[PDB]
Amino acid sequence: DLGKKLLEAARAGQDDEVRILMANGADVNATDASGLTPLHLAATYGHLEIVEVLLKHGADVNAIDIMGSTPLHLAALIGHLEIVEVLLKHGADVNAVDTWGDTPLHLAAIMGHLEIVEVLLKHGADVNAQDKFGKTAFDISIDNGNEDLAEILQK
Amino acid sequence: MREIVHIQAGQCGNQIGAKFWEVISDEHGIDPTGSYHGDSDLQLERINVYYNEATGNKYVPRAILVDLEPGTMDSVRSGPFGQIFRPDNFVFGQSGAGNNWAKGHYTEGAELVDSVLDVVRKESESCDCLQGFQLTHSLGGGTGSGMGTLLISKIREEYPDRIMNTFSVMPSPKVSDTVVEPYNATLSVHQLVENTDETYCIDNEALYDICFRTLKLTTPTYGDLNHLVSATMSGVTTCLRFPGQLNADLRKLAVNMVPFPRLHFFMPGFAPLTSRGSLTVPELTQQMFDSKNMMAACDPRHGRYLTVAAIFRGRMSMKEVDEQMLNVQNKNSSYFVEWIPNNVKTAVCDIPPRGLKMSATFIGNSTAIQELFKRISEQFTAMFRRKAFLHWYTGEGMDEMEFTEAESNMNDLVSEYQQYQDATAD
Amino acid sequence: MRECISIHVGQAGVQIGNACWELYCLEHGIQPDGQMPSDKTIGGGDDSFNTFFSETGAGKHVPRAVFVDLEPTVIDEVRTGTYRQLFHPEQLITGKEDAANNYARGHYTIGKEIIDLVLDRIRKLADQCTGLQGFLVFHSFGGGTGSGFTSLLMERLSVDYGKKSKLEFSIYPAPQVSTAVVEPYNSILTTHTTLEHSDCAFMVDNEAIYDICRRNLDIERPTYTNLNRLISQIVSSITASLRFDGALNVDLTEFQTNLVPYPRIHFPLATYAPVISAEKAYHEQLSVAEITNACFEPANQMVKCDPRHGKYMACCLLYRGDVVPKDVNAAIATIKTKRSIQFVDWCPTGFKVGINYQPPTVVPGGDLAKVQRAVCMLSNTTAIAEAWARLDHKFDLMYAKRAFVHWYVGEGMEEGEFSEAREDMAALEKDYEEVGV
Numbered sequence A: 001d002l003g004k005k006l007l008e009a010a011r012a013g014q015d016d017e018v019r020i021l022m023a024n025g026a027d028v029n030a031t032d033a034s035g036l037t038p039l040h041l042a043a044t045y046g047h048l049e050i051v052e053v054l055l056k057h058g059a060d061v062n063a064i065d066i067m068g069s070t071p072l073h074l075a076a077l078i079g080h081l082e083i084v085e086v087l088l089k090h091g092a093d094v095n096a097v098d099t100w101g102d103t104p105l106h107l108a109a110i111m112g113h114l115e116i117v118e119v120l121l122k123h124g125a126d127v128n129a130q131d132k133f134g135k136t137a138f139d140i141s142i143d144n145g146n147e148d149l150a151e152i153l154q155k
Numbered sequence B: 001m002r003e004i005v006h007i008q009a010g011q012c013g014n015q016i017g018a019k020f021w022e023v024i025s026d027e028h029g030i031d032p033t034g035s036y037h038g039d040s041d042l043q044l045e046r047i048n049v050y051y052n053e054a055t056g057n058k059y060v061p062r063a064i065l066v067d068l069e070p071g072t073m074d075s076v077r078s079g080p081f082g083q084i085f086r087p088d089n090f091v092f093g094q095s096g097a098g099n100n101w102a103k104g105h106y107t108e109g110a111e112l113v114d115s116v117l118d119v120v121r122k123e124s125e126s127c128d129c130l131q132g133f134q135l136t137h138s139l140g141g142g143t144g145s146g147m148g149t150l151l152i153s154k155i156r157e158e159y160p161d162r163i164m165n166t167f168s169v170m171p172s173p174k175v176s177d178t179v180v181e182p183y184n185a186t187l188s189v190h191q192l193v194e195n196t197d198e199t200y201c202i203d204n205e206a207l208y209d210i211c212f213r214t215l216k217l218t219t220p221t222y223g224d225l226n227h228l229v230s231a232t233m234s235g236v237t238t239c240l241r242f243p244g245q246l247n248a249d250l251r252k253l254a255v256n257m258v259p260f261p262r263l264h265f266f267m268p269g270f271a272p273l274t275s276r277g278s279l280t281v282p283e284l285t286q287q288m289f290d291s292k293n294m295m296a297a298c299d300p301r302h303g304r305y306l307t308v309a310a311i312f313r314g315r316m317s318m319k320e321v322d323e324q325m326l327n328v329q330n331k332n333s334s335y336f337v338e339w340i341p342n343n344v345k346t347a348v349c350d351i352p353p354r355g356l357k358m359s360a361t362f363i364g365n366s367t368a369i370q371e372l373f374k375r376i377s378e379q380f381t382a383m384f385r386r387k388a389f390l391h392w393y394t395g396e397g398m399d400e401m402e403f404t405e406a407e408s409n410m411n412d413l414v415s416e417y418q419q420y421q422d423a424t425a426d
Numbered sequence C: 001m002r003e004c005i006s007i008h009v010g011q012a013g014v015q016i017g018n019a020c021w022e023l024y025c026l027e028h029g030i031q032p033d034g035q036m037p038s039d040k041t042i043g044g045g046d047d048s049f050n051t052f053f054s055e056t057g058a059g060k061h062v063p064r065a066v067f068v069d070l071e072p073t074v075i076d077e078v079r080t081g082t083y084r085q086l087f088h089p090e091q092l093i094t095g096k097e098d099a100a101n102n103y104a105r106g107h108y109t110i111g112k113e114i115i116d117l118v119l120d121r122i123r124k125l126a127d128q129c130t131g132l133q134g135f136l137v138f139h140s141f142g143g144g145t146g147s148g149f150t151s152l153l154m155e156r157l158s159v160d161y162g163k164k165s166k167l168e169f170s171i172y173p174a175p176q177v178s179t180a181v182v183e184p185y186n187s188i189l190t191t192h193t194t195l196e197h198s199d200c201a202f203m204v205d206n207e208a209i210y211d212i213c214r215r216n217l218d219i220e221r222p223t224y225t226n227l228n229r230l231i232s233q234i235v236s237s238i239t240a241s242l243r244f245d246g247a248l249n250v251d252l253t254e255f256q257t258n259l260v261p262y263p264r265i266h267f268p269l270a271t272y273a274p275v276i277s278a279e280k281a282y283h284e285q286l287s288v289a290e291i292t293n294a295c296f297e298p299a300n301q302m303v304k305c306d307p308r309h310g311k312y313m314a315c316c317l318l319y320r321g322d323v324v325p326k327d328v329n330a331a332i333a334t335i336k337t338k339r340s341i342q343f344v345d346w347c348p349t350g351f352k353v354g355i356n357y358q359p360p361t362v363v364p365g366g367d368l369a370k371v372q373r374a375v376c377m378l379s380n381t382t383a384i385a386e387a388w389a390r391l392d393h394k395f396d397l398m399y400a401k402r403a404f405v406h407w408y409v410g411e412g413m414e415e416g417e418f419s420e421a422r423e424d425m426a427a428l429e430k431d432y433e434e435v436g437v
């Protein structure tokens, strides 16, 4: 089973090994116990070029783990602007919702990734989507007193 | 109550800890060579509080400089006052924590804590009547956070009848957009709740907002920020370093500022706000209570004041200060709790700091400080729910239960501030 | 005669004691180094001033006094001030670490370190008395040493000197010149633990003295030196009966006899007149009637309360200076008729009178003008209960929330003791209502 080896290779950032495993038939869309795919772990650890090569080889860009997290969610949380852009250009759902009601925009606002915040807004992020507690991205901004975030969401 | 053992740990702590000595040595007339070249007796009356006098009219700061990254000792030495510190107290490891709290608290830091405690005992034995311990550090890193809180706990064990006071820098994405800092702050706030008696909250979010929108600096550096930190630390230590009508010490502060043991997180403020390089009494009392002047990005008008201590510096009618301070408590009576009589205390100091001629420093125990802990906890919940980078902790020795417990203790603190925020007298 | 020892505790007790002994020197003709030219008997004496000053072989006159503080700074000023050569240097006792405005420290933790030495030093002064009457005790309410160490000391002396009376001068706190937010707690716990161990306590409300210093003396922002000079003149007029010739309040037994009908209601209210600024050096000299009628102006009281809304159980008049006994009668005879001054039904409606014919002394550098006659009225009125109610509610506002309580339990004290003391104050408030306020 090479799928268990691709998952660890993407996480570590070994580009040549990922090419090796895919050529030998490894499951690009395998999952670990928590439903994470190699695309999830490449995006979470900022290994951009592994993300890129995976997309051109059939990876499911909207694959959700057992908590409903898409690769775009994890990229926005950790704050990887380029990978955020690459995912959106490869069919990522900008307003996907995990099991806590969070969209990616929810996560980029909470962590202060104001650059990624602007990107999501331009690419269709809904400013009206509520989490489980019923807070939009703007609702989050006024609560924690983030005037920089508030300005970006009003425009 | 005379002697204080000042410690500075990690990159941030040593940076603000070195600025602290640079500003108070100037105030007390001490030069980079340890010589006293002042012209006032008021600078040496309580000079022993922070300085160990030596031979040849030398004054060595009672300071213990700690870090895991060996580079920090180099940046401190190349500073103007970088050779006044006793070389024996310099304790620096070889492998930094790399923004990992577990390395600071459990592995890399824990192998070096005995080297620091040995130094603490040396300085504490030279104390005729030691008050307690002081620390400057960050919460969002690995050394000042992880190792700093371990040191606070171990010193607590060997000197339980002394007071521990910390200067603690709260992380902000506006100054450091690193996602592991919510974990490290929450793990650090959990420790500060149990182990310290009083903690000053110096939030990098507030420092950024002050430098960027109030002072108009489009790209603040660690200089613009620490210019605010070192001034605050001058204010809240004034009545410890100069005679004054009160014999204020770390315990008299604690007993009258801390109504319940866990609510010892203060919100310091400073007036006037000013940038480096580049005022009547009713203005000073006004600006001192303004949200724009707080060193923690909380709006005090969203909560109530449990206790306040405000110190002025310079030449001004002490009678006018009394009238203005009584005026603030009459026109803002809905922001001070009614079930603590005479909960505001004022002191005036003759010698102002540098540059400025007037000074006003604010120390608040405000229920609005929950907004800070809410902001951090929101960032911690998002990271921890996705288990992001959690293996960087359990791989050092931690277990997942230490994350939930520090998280459980943090949100309790928010409920406690809200409770007393709604408590009435009737 | 019969000797008196004065114990001064904490900063406030020491700073008042320093000013009081200064005034005592001037009034008696004692020079700062102890010599007393008018004392015709060297090395001994049976005079009335020997209640306060023992004598050595070289003609020195040394106060019967002890000064105790847990920190050194305040007493170090007395060890090196003007009257440094006056006191027994062994009776100037200091620790290193004060009580941090915490009753529990002063009484339990820190106070334990020095309570034995304090007594042995007291014992050395007692060894020199022929017939000790008892003790004068000067201490703050709101401080940690003034409260906690005082009550521990009063507990000890009541075991070791069971036949000697105790009289306290205790400074009641005010927010104007206050120190600690916890001073209500300290004052309630010191009142409970000392109540059974003190015969008569003279309270001094800092709020009352502060206002008199501002009004009658035109001092914009009084300092503790300003307050303590006025306090000492009032203390002098209250203790003069022990130090000079006289027929009223001649010893500590009679203070209890005249002023305290029931032992728990032992808090007399002192009123004093006239108070006139030294800048009015050419003031007209008020008459006996004027200064006597001024003993019923609430302004001139050392504890802010309204004796109109109360009943008197005792009323003594202490005059100093140019005072004709007949003039006292006409001034009082008006008070019994024209003014509404109610005594309780069970007390002989009468004013006891003492007259000392020398005018009061003023200290050089003071704030008071010289006057030809003055009067100190010691009464016992139910209206002082108002001062207890004012303090008891400030306690209630914090105690309901248990604010600051862990500071006490963490210093050797049981949380319940708060409740036993507060009920004791409720019983005292009922004590004054039962008597008739």
Ligand SMILES: Nc1nc2c(ncn2[C@@H]2O[C@H](COP(=O)(O)OP(=O)(O)OP(=O)(O)O)[C@@H](O)[C@H]2O)c(=O)[nH]1
Pocket (backbone or CB within 6 Å): C009, C010, C011, C012, C013, C015, C016, C070, C071, C098, C099, C100, C101, C102, C139, C140, C141, C142, C143, C144, C145, C146, C147, C171, C172, C173, C174, C177, C178, C179, C180, C183, C206, C224, C225, C227, C228, C231
């Ligand atoms: N009238 C008067 N009051 C004073 C003086 N000094 C302090 N006080 C009052 O006494 C109270 C404080 O208690 P202190 O006697 O200073 O405390 P302490 O006995 O020294 O005990 P510590 O807590 O150990 O310092 C406050 O209410 C002050 O307003 C003084 O010189 N004169």
Ligand SMILES: Nc1nc2c(ncn2[C@@H]2O[C@H](COP(=O)(O)OP(=O)(O)O)[C@@H](O)[C@H]2O)c(=O)[nH]1
Pocket (backbone or CB within 6 Å): B009, B010, B011, B012, B013, B015, B016, B067, B097, B098, B099, B100, B138, B139, B140, B141, B142, B143, B144, B145, B169, B170, B171, B172, B175, B176, B181, B204, B207, B222, B225, B226, B229
């Ligand atoms: N205000 C201020 N914050 C700092 C400074 N240096 C680092 N920090 C903050 O401290 C946190 C990182 O901790 P740091 O002291 O740099 O690393 P450590 O050695 O592990 O303690 C981050 O939140 C930084 O933003 C400084 O000079 N001033």
Ligand SMILES: COc1ccc(/N=N/c2cc(OC)c(OC)c(OC)c2)cc1O
Pocket (backbone or CB within 6 Å): B235, B236, B237, B238, B239, B240, B248, B249, B250, B252, B253, B256, B257, B307, B308, B309, B310, B311, B342, B343, B344, B345, B346, B347, C178, C179, C180, C181, C182
């Ligand atoms: C409301 O009740 C109180 C609260 C705080 C009290 N004073 N604490 C201090 C005050 C200081 O400056 C004003 C200070 O200098 C910065 C200080 O240094 C340690 C202590 C006293 C109170 O009675």
Ligand SMILES: [Ca+2]
Pocket (backbone or CB within 6 Å): C039, C040, C041, C042, C043, C044, C045, C046, C055
């Ligand atoms: Ca004689």
Ligand SMILES: [Mg+2]
Pocket (backbone or CB within 6 Å): C010, C011, C071, C098, C143, C145
């Ligand atoms: Mg004291």
